[PDB]
């Protein structure tokens, strides 16, 4: 219908936070491999001079940016790991919603604001938020440990 059909990269840029919540795979994919699929595929064109005359001016432009894309990507996958949820896309926590971050209610958050819009209104607190989830894991990580000893 709408959630089971085509959309496109970054299509829900101006769609509500709730709307975008279906089209994650679209922008959760191609973060990496958006280019490694295309590069490997298009680069094996019948040229036979891939990296001829060793490396060149486009030589570093790519590798300086190839090596970025992955660590940039592995940075967000390191957060999923360190927050104990690499299920991605959507994941709940014990960290509760400090209304000091946003006093607003549920109804309008998901059905009126968009993520671009939202992440701005919440940009300043994200640092403090993100650090709360890490300390949420470690409480849980010690509580796990304590029980590993006695059983």
């Amino acid at each position, epitope marked *: 219908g709408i959630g089971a059909v085509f959309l496109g990269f970054l299509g829900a840029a101006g769609s509500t936070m709730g709307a975008a919540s279906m089209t994650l795979t679209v922008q959760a994919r191609l973060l990496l491999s958006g280019i490694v699929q295309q590069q490997n595929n298009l680069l094996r064109a019948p040229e036979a001079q891939e990296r001829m005359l060793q490396l060149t001016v486009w030589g570093i432009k790519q590798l300086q940016a190839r090596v970025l894309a992955v660590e940039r990507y592995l940075g967000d996958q390191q957060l999923l790991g360190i927050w104990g949820c690499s299920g991605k896309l959507i994941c709940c926590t014990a960290v509760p919603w400090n209304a000091s971050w946003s006093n607003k209610s549920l*109804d*309008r958050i998901w059905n009126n604001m968009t993520w671009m819009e939202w992440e701005r209104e919440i940009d300043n607190y994200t640092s403090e938020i993100y650090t709360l989830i890490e300390e949420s894991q470690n409480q849980q990580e010690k509580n796990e440990q304590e029980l590993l000893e006695l059983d």
Partner: nanobody
Amino acid sequence: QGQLVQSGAELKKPGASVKISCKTSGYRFNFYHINWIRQTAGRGPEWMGWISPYSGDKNLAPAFQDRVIMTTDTEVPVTSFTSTGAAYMEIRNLKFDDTGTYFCAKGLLRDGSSTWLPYLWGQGTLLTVSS
């Protein structure tokens, strides 16, 4: 966070035309509906109809479905998050009881149950109809 303005009191006669527009500020005109409500003293504040400035879909009141026709202009962005725009509602074959303080009203949400239901309200420019 925004504000709406309208067309001033346009005196007309029974059996004529009268046009009443609404212009926006401080919000994305396309993102929200535009409703229309008067203040007939005899009937009450009767709701006329709403229209989407994005999808062009309407839902007029069967009372004036054939009588009135709605229409909108393009949106003129101010910032990356705000804009300005125009919308209309003309009514022909007028009578006497088509009068009151006329309000335009922007919707509440972009999505949900109360999508079209108005939150922000216009000026209220009074209209009388006599020869």
